[PDB]
Structure formats: C-alpha cells, structure tokens
Amino acid sequence: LGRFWHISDLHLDPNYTVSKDPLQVCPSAGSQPVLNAGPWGDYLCDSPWALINSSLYAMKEIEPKPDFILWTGDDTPHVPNESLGEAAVLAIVERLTNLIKEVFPDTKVYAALGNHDFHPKNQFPAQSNRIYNQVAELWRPWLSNESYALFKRGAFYSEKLPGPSRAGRVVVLNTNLYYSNNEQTAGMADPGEQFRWLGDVLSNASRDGEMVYVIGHVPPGFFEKTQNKAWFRESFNEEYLKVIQKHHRVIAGQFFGHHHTDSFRMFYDNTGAPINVMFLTPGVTPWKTTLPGVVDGANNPGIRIFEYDRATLNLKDLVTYFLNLRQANVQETPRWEQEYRLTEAYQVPDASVSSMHTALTRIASEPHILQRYYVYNSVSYNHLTCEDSCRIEHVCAIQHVAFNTYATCLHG
C-alpha cells in the first residue's frame, strides 16, 4: 500500500501583513475590509507564507515519506495583472518549489501549472515561452530529459512512477490551454496537439501494460458551487470526454484542482457504465471567491493524501486534513487535523469507480450523506444546511461533465 500527497491552489499572497488598517492586510481581498486579521490567514485573503509553510510541514508530520507528491498549481494571488508581473510570478513559483524540495528533498513531485501561474493570468500559449522555459528549469530534478523538452514546448509531459509501483505512469496536463478566458488558444482545435499527444500516451500505456494517473489544474465539467459555470470551451470539454471514453481502461485516477472545494466527477460510457472518477482536491488558500453568484464561498485550508495499490494503481482511500482557520488564528501554532477518511464518510470499501458511484447515489438520496458531503465541500467551513437548489447543483455537477446532460439535469 503506497501513499501520495495531492496539494493544489496554494495561492501565495506576498503582501499579506497583519495590519491595523483593514484595507492594507492583503491585496487579494480587493476592496473588502479585513478586520482583525490573524497570522495564519483570513477567509478574505489568499495564503500568507506562514500558512503555506504550515501546510508543507503538516504534510511532513502526517507522512514524511510519500511515494510521490502531486502538485496541480495556482501559486499566485488573486490580484489585477498590473499588480503581478512576470518576474514576480516566476519568483513565487520558485519559492514554493524550493519549499517542497526543502521539506521533501528525496520525493519525486509531479507538478502542473495552474491558470494563475502565468503573466497575464490565464493566457497560456500553445508554444514555448519564458515561463514554460524557466519553470522547466525549476522542475528539472523532477523531469526526465524527454519531459524536460516537452515542458518547454507546452507545459505537459508524462513520467514513469518510481519503484515500487509495478507499471505506473503519471500524465501531467496543461488544461489552462482550454480555459474559456484564454485568448491565446481561441480558434485552435488541438492547441499544442495535447489531445493527440494524450491519446498516444494512453495508447502506449495500454500496449505496455501500464496504468496511468492523469493530473491537471483546470478540470472539465462544471463548478458545483454555482449553476452553468464551466471552465473549458465546449469543444475542448467534448474532446476531453472523448479521450476518457476511449482510454478509461488504462486511467486509474484523475486528480485536479482549481475549484478550491472538495468534490468529484463521475464519467460514464454510452452504456451507462461508470468508467472513471476525477477527484477535485481542496485548496490551501481559504480565499473567499469573487465569482458572481457564489455566497460565502470561502474554505478552510486543505491537504489530501491518497492510499493506493502499488501493483495496480487502484485507489484504496483518501484522507483529507484541514486547518480550522478560525481556531488556528487564536493559537500560537496551527495544528492540522484529519477532516475525513473517504471509506468512513461514505461507507464504501475503497475509492474505486464503483465505490464513488455508490457515494454519489447516497449523496443524492440520503439527507445526512448529502450534508456530510456539503460540509466537506468547503473543508468544513460552512455548516448550514444544503437545501434543494444546493443539492441539485452539486449532484448535477458530480454526475454530468458533458454540457448537454448537465443542462438537462438542472431542469430538476
């Protein structure tokens, strides 16, 4: 039984300062007053370094020798582009990279860029550029010669897993190419040929008897905290689904971030069979989202460990740990605690597709499992009751990655 960490959406705010002026605590809060800010963060702000540093040392205390770490990006604060130039973006990525290397010096890391890990934000090109080149240098100790060259061209690559994993591979995607807000890829059907490449990698995995973990930042499908919000342009969403439907047999897991909340996505084939599951891990940043329509969209800082079978990559469980930020900010040292273990929360034997399908059916039919899922969705920040509209937004998002079936579900 192996273990790996999945961390995402650290979002450092470099200028976080405990101040008596509520409007000069953190630029990531915009114009919002930040009253009595604490040293470990505030729900209106992106992460101070002290929170990020806390999260990495909490990982080391919980499991200092993971088989590997998945890191799915988004390192910089939610501020205007004019406040955050290219040099600062790269310095922030480098600082976080060095922290991970310092705390886990012997651990392989599989790292993807998030949509904020660029200047201007979200404008990821389908060709080489200074950011891809420089990040490739930062992550070179983690990259094969082949992955190094591929990262410079498109910030995507695939790597063998280390022993003792029998026949495993991690595929690292740049799904920021597919974000609707990315004008660099408008009018391109296969930017960087990433979909063609991905299919070839997965065909190779089948030929070679390997199983694959796919990771990336921006997920396909919709955002469970609202209605009708998808990140991918529709054509890219369709193409991603087509890849999963063709190659699901070799995909043992999908691991994404970007939402900052805790959820999962089911994939089905045209016979209704469940064929894959994507796990959306919460963020370390607690930052209350500015997305229109979302009310009180903050979360507690979260980190996640997966348990897996090294021989098959079958996912046996996940444990999510969290920092109760409200409590931590009256304390001398933040102390992270277990939030939940998946098998216990949903009374399923493992984290397989069949088990996650059962979890979904219980979320959709049992009030107390729905509420349990909903509390964990914000990393136990919000304990209010998830009513009917909330229920339908979450169930439809978990169940339907496709645009058209999601929309029909929302008629419910």
Ligand X SMILES: *[C@@H]1O[C@H](CO[C@@H]2O[C@@H](C)[C@@H](O)[C@@H](O)[C@@H]2O)[C@@H](O[C@@H]2O[C@H](CO)[C@@H](O)[C@H](O)[C@H]2NC(C)=O)[C@H](O)[C@H]1NC(C)=O
Ligand Y SMILES: *[C@@H]1O[C@H](CO)[C@@H](O[C@@H]2O[C@H](CO)[C@@H](O[C@@H]3O[C@H](CO)[C@@H](O)[C@H](O[C@H]4O[C@H](CO)[C@@H](O)[C@H](O)[C@@H]4O)[C@@H]3O)[C@H](O)[C@H]2NC(C)=O)[C@H](O)[C@H]1NC(C)=O
Ligand Z SMILES: *[C@@H]1O[C@H](CO)[C@@H](O[C@@H]2O[C@H](CO)[C@@H](O)[C@H](O)[C@H]2NC(C)=O)[C@H](O)[C@H]1NC(C)=O
Ligand U SMILES: C[N+](C)(C)CCOP(=O)(O)O
Residue numbers belonging to the annotated binding site: 9, 11, 74, 115, 217, 258, 260
Least distance to ligand Z, CB of residue 257, Å? 23
Of the residues 18, 50, 62, 409, which one makes contact with ligand Z according to CB under 6 A: 50
312 near ligand X, judged by CB under 6 A: no
Least distance to ligand Z, CB of residue 284, Å? 14
CA atoms within 13 A on the CB side of 275: 20
Cα–Cα distance between 277 and 260 in angstroms, integer? 18
CA nearest neighbour of 390 among 367, 374, 403, 411: 374
Contact partner at residue 53 from Zn ion, ligand Z, ligand U, none, CB < 5 to 8 Å by partner kind? ligand Z
* Residues of this chain, 130-159, that bind ligand Y according to CB under 6 A: 145-146
9 near Zn ion, judged by CB under 5 A: yes
57 near ligand Z, judged by CB under 6 A: yes
252 near ligand X, judged by CB under 6 A: no
Least distance to ligand X, CB of residue 30, Å? 11
CA nearest neighbour of 322 among 307, 340, 301: 301
Cα–Cα distance between 227 and 231 in angstroms, integer? 12
Annotated binding site for Zn(2+): 9, 11, 74, 115, 217, 258, 260
The interface mask with ligand U, positions 370-399, x = CB under 6 A, is ------------------------------
361 near ligand Y, judged by CB under 6 A: no
The interface mask with ligand Z, positions 321-350, x = CB under 6 A, is ------------------------------
Q: What share of the chain is helix, strand, coil (3-state, %, to 5)?
A: 40, 20, 40
Of the residues 152, 233, 258, 362, which one makes contact with ligand U according to CB under 6 A: 258
The interface mask with ligand U, positions 87-126, x = CB under 6 A, is ----------------------------xx----------
193 dihedral zone (left: phi>0; alpha: psi -120 to 50; beta): left
CA nearest neighbour of 43 among 286, 237, 332: 286
Cα–Cα distance between 255 and 388 in angstroms, integer? 28
Amino acid at 73: G
- Residue keyed to tokens 């705010």: 13
Q: Token pair for residue 249?
A: 């047999």
Amino acid at 346: Y
Cα–Cα distance between 31 and 45 in angstroms, integer? 11
115 near Zn ion, judged by CB under 5 A: yes
Of the residues 15, 53, 128, 226, which one makes contact with ligand Z according to CB under 6 A: 53
74 near Zn ion, judged by CB under 5 A: yes
55 near ligand U, judged by CB under 6 A: no
CA nearest neighbour of 174 among 97, 259, 232: 232
Contact 322, 300 (CB under 8 A): yes
Residues within the interface to ligand Y (CB under 6 A): 145-146, 197, 200-201, 204
Residues within the interface to ligand X (CB under 6 A): 14-15, 27, 77, 79, 82-84
